Enzyme design. Structure first.
Site, PDB file in Angstrom:
ATOM      1  CE  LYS A  57       3.418  -7.575  -6.267  1.00  0.00           C
ATOM      2  NZ  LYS A  57       4.860  -7.515  -6.251  1.00  0.00           N
ATOM      3  CG  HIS A  59       0.729  -2.948  -5.939  1.00  0.00           C
ATOM      4  ND1 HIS A  59       0.531  -3.598  -7.107  1.00  0.00           N
ATOM      5  CD2 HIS A  59       1.987  -3.078  -6.024  1.00  0.00           C
ATOM      6  CE1 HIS A  59       1.490  -4.206  -7.522  1.00  0.00           C
ATOM      7  NE2 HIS A  59       2.384  -3.892  -6.876  1.00  0.00           N
ATOM      8  CE  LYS A  91       8.105  -6.701  -2.218  1.00  0.00           C
ATOM      9  NZ  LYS A  91       7.191  -5.883  -2.809  1.00  0.00           N
ATOM     10  CG  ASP A  94       6.331  -9.694  12.874  1.00  0.00           C
ATOM     11  OD1 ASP A  94       6.582 -10.691  13.592  1.00  0.00           O
ATOM     12  OD2 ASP A  94       6.256  -8.477  13.174  1.00  0.00           O
ATOM     13  NE  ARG A 221       4.774   3.909 -14.192  1.00  0.00           N
ATOM     14  CZ  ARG A 221       4.049   5.007 -13.983  1.00  0.00           C
ATOM     15  NH1 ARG A 221       3.032   4.807 -13.402  1.00  0.00           N
ATOM     16  NH2 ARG A 221       4.533   5.838 -14.525  1.00  0.00           N
TER      17      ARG A 221
END
Lengths: 252, 260
Positions: A57, A59, A91, A94, A221
């Site tokens: 994942k 970011h 995320k 719209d 983490r």
């Protein structure tokens, strides 16, 4: 639930089937969530965790030096070398061309490299249809979407009714919506849906979430912060997640 | 509700105070929502609508040629010249440093120029506190936030309970959260809150216009409690004269307000 191997053979979504096969072959249901500041730290960690994960994942919005040549290219190479998929954090929330362009264009061009993405269901099914069309227009490669059915942040509004509404939206496209980011099982099996349940905030314990129906554990983490050795932590969490999975009863 | 002028004089948010005063002084409660593909068309339309609006809703993500120099710079000059605020579309929906940087950095650096922004409440109060801190760090200029309490898109999940939850989140900061994007009054007066109600999907029920007749009318929403009417393509699409439409909608919006 059916085994990962079995779900890979029956799932309607090519990206989901690919993910299920990786999980079966590498004996891992571990997703590493790496929210670091530089591409250098990211690549270093992915190199160390690659063999132990089924999904990474990313970011990209917090990276200070993101670039297609310096970040995506080597990331794609790592994904290929160690065999794991890419899941970007963004995320989406719209509809229409705005969401299509937030997913397909800009500097990040997420749809061009992220196998999987996630969206908030609050805006309605338009986010699903919009993202689906954008994916198809950008690439022929398998693309899948997770709905953010249950959030973990303080004061979140992902209540029982909201989650129910989110699951309903998911039912509108079993080909593109492969599952949810949630804390528990979302059912669906009696209706012909086979949803991937990816659960963040794991360190709740692995045994706990996997026992409640989680298919993938998302650990952040706990894998690399505080001077931890990511290679070692990757194996520790993989083992815990896999063993938990082997213990839970499968559909016979 | 009290008049816009009265609300400006007692509002805790400097951004809301500035907006209510703009509305009174220009006799308008119209917000022009311009989702065009090029900066050139954007600047042309803003020029024509400037005198008629209190707020401009931009859509930077669909622009094919966005630039701080070519888009934001002239946009700010226009808002200063015609006296209207800037509201960027981007519906923030995350927390922490992620939402802070999505709002403060990137190519858009929205917090540097957008007086008003909006966020989804689903993620919780963290989105409010995060955007608030980002705003304070980026600029000395006052900034305001709108919570997306009631969505109008098909199948949205903004139910009664979701809306109530969003309203509770807005209560956590009356200094920064100035109001909502909604379809009805959200109350709050007895509790000491004076929220701006901005409502999209507004039309004027024009003769022979089936597409436009799908929207609630200016009279309908203002009578219901909307403070600002957000009008889009109805102001410029299909060969319409933006300046003419702007006056038409400003006029209807204000007359309904006075009637109220």
């Amino acid at each position: 639930k059916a085994t990962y191997k079995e779900r890979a053979a029956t799932h309607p979504s090519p990206v989901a089937a690919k993910l299920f096969n990786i999980m079966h072959e590498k004996q891992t249901n571990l997703c590493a969530s790496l929210d670091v500041r530089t591409t250098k730290e990211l690549l270093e960690l992915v190199e160390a965790l690659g063999p132990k994960i089924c999904l990474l994942k990313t970011h990209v919005d917090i990276l200070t030096d993101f670039s297609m040549e310096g970040t995506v290219k080597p990331l794609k190479a790592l994904s290929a070398k160690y065999n794991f998929l890419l899941f970007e954090n963004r995320k989406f929330a719209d509809i229409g061309n705005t969401v299509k362009l937030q997913y397909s264009a800009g500097v990040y061009r997420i749809a061009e490299w992220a196998d999987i993405t996630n969206a908030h269901g609050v805006v309605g099914p338009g986010i699903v249809s919009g993202l689906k069309q954008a994916a198809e227009e950008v690439t022929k490669e398998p693309r899948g979407l997770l709905m953010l059915a249950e959030l973990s942040c303080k004061g979140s509004l992902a209540t029982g009714e909201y989650t129910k509404g989110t699951v309903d939206i998911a039912k509108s496209d079993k080909d593109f919506v492969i599952g949810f980011i949630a804390q528990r099982d979302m059912g669906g099996r009696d209706e012909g849906y086979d949803w991937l349940i990816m659960t963040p905030g794991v360190g709740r314990t692995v045994d706990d979430v996997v026992s409640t129906g989680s298919d993938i554990i998302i650990v952040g983490r706990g894998l690399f912060a505080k001077g931890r050795d990511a290679k070692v932590e990757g194996e520790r969490y993989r083992k815990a997640g896999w063993e938990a999975y082997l213990r839970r009863c499968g559909q016979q």
